[PDB]
Amino acid sequence: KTFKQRRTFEQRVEDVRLIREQHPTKIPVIIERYKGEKQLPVLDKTKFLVPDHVNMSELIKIIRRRLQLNANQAFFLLVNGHSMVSVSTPISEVYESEKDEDGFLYMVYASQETF
Ligand SMILES: COc1ccccc1-c1nnco1
Ligand SMILES: [Cl-]
């Protein structure tokens, strides 16, 4: 079902190196619904190219716009398995510290703060 399940470590590594070559200013982001989630819909896609200058605050707004949420629907975004320490961090900085060994930045969303 999940991205790591669908693609070999070889295939994920090679995709990230191609994005470097073809989208050199973009951060390669996997965004997945929490396997538990009941309230929020699933995204139309899995793999996002995020401009490397937006901070996490702007990425949360983007994703809430992609899910077409409304103001008082709750939405929580884990990065590399854990809560975000701060939303003001530029995604270029977040990438360099939170990226997986395959080169993707992994994110999971829920309506619950308890995942
Ligand atoms: C195979 O090399 C690449 C081609 C494209 C982008 C990155 C790399 C790379 N970086 N570290 C190892 O490979
Ligand atoms: Cl680019």
Side-chain angles (χ1 to χ4, degrees), residues 17-40:
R17 289 177 179 179
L18 173 71
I19 299 174
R20 272 176 223 162
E21 196 75 2
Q22 292 196 334
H23 304 277
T25 80
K26 296 319 167 37
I27 298 312
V29 182
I30 307 303
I31 311 177
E32 284 184 310
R33 192 173 69 164
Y34 177 56
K35 67 184 298 301
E37 181 60 25
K38 289 320 196 168
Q39 314 310 316
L40 302 174

Side-chain angles (χ1 to χ4, degrees), residues 30-107:
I30 307 303
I31 311 177
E32 284 184 310
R33 192 173 69 164
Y34 177 56
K35 67 184 298 301
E37 181 60 25
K38 289 320 196 168
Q39 314 310 316
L40 302 174
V42 294
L43 288 173
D44 55 290
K45 74 184 184 156
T46 306
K47 185 176 71 165
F48 293 83
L49 306 193
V50 182
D52 85 333
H53 58 87
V54 312
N55 65 19
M56 295 304 302
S57 189
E58 183 48 27
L59 186 56
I60 292 157
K61 290 183 193 197
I62 291 169
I63 295 163
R64 292 176 61 85
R65 283 196 291 270
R66 190 123 196 174
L67 295 168
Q68 278 299 261
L69 299 196
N70 51 66
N72 55 2
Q73 291 174 270
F75 169 98
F76 300 94
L77 191 67
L78 298 186
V79 180
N80 169 51
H82 57 84
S83 299
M84 291 162 33
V85 172
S86 199
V87 307
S88 73
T89 335
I91 198 168
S92 51
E93 254 155 56
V94 179
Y95 183 69
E96 273 205 14
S97 98
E98 299 302 327
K99 62 195 175 300
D100 191 271
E101 291 213 312
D102 70 4
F104 282 107
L105 193 55
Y106 287 85
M107 298 195 188

